[PDB]
Design a protein around this ligand. Structure first.
Ligand code: PLP
Ligand code: PLP
Lengths: 281, 281
């Protein structure tokens, strides 16, 4: 059971883990987020996740209080303190306890810890049902805390019989969901995913590398909404999903709705990347 | 000196006013904001501010825990407890202590209180210096907590010798700043302001009503970026600014940089609306 989180380098019991209401995340949604899994006592691809956290932080001009080695030390320390080998880990960096409820100061750094999600890498053979939604995320290259459109859409998603969405910039250009990268497999087995105005996911990185190592053509380009009709397969990548089959987008079933051949092969290769990472720890 | 805030109907000393880190504002920037002044012990235009708070809340499907009369009671109660007649009042409604760090639950309601800002209705004769910035706010009709673009821009604004910005949707359509409505006065004395994809401010409402009562033509329409060259005057409206002269946008000085005739008249009429409000309390 999880005992402690970390706030600004201090291990705190979870029930005393609070921020004063003057924090800019609370008042102004100002801050950055990262999330990664731990397996066999090891945060997966940690250097990549931590590099991204420091890059996100730079774009909001927030100084993380310690260097990457120290943050890594604190993460490992919090796994040992909670006596856990398998976990979800959130990093949050807020704009801080602003004097004027707008100007950022020293940021508040949060490290929170959860059980490894039950659904982590479920790899269901049955593809999920999703809807298109016209929208473009703000500062899309930055992993901000700003998830209001995706959270607000939950009601419409569930209402319409979907479990998720795919953002289409002005109903024209396929991007990503609120929390997942999006990919198409073409009938010639070319893999397509968005290159611009999307978050560069750590899963997306490992899956693209694994696809190119298997000899797949992987095109990073703008994707027109009409190109859904060209695709055999659709999947998401994310830290929790790994590779997740999408069986339906609006009124289009992909194949018979069950996971496509390349999607299944990419699930195995993703697990290959994980195992290869854990062999270097 | 301010003694108490209110969290979920409980008066709390300001130094114990905290949220648990599982709050969706902190993790996901999910929630809504309002701010109003109190003068002579009275929140200005309170019914309009509270109607807007309940409308914002509805759009994020967050239920405010009590009805408008009860919230009003709690606001008045917090003025009495702090023994203050002049103040700034923040309302925050977050997505709550989510079980999964995404799905909203019962929201957290915050009422915070500050001194009336020093700069409230300064009405400087010297117009401010601002820059255009290409950007469109998300859910612009909703007063969300999402101010990351405006806060992140602070550095560039100050760098470039400005004190503020004006968002232009795709560099074409004039909207608003991060925290102010934007208006143009044409040389025929027609007042122009954006009607769509901007927050409907309470100040903007009172100034538009006051302009129409003075016999001004007030056009609520889309404004092309090239129409800045048609305008004699530019001003902001906001709860703290009231009516604020803009003397420079990028490389354009409006007149001689000092407040324009209609802007000055609208400052007086705004104060007229305030006084008329306070006479009904
Ligand atoms: C976090 C996130 C992703 C996925 O990134 P991973 O590093 O694979 O978890 C995709 N899109 C958005 C908007 C995200 O926030
Ligand atoms: C709050 C706000 C305004 C101004 O509204 P007032 O009710 O006059 O203070 C304008 N634009 C945005 C985006 C705001 O959040």
């Amino acid at each position: 059971m999880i005992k402690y989180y970390n706030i600004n380098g201090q291990q705190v019991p979870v029930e005393n883990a609070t921020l004063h209401v003057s924090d800019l995340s609370i008042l102004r949604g100002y801050g950055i987020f990262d999330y990664f899994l731990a397996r066999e006592g090891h945060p997966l691809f940690l250097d990549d996740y931590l590099n991204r956290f420091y890059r996100s932080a730079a774009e909001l001009y927030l100084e993380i209080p310690f260097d990457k080695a120290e943050l890594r030390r604190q993460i490992y320390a919090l796994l040992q303190a909670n006596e856990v080998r398998e976990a979800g880990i959130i990093l949050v960096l807020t704009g801080g306890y602003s004097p004027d409820g707008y100007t950022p100061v020293n940021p508040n750094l949060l490290i929170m810890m959860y059980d490894l999600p039950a659904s982590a890498w479920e790899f269901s053979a049955q593809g999920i049902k999703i809807i298109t939604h016209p929208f473009q995320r703000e500062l899309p290259e930055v992993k901000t805390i700003n998830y209001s459109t995706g959270i607000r859409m939950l009601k419409t998603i569930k209402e319409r019989g979907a479990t998720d969405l795919i953002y289409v910039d002005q109903g024209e250009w396929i991007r990503e969901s609120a929390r997942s990268n999006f990919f198409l497999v073409m009938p010639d087995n070319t893999i397509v995913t968005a290159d611009e105005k999307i978050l560069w996911g750590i899963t997306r990185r490992q899956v693209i590398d694994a696809a190119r190592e298997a000899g797949y053509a992987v095109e990073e380009r703008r994707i027109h909404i009409t190109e859904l009709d060209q695709a055999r397969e659709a999947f998401f990548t994310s830290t929790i999903k790994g590779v997740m089959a999408i069986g339906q987008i609006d009124d289009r079933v992909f194949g018979d709705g069950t996971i496509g051949k390349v999607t299944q092969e990419l699930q195995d290769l993703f697990v290959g990347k994980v195992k290869a990472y854990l062999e270097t720890c």
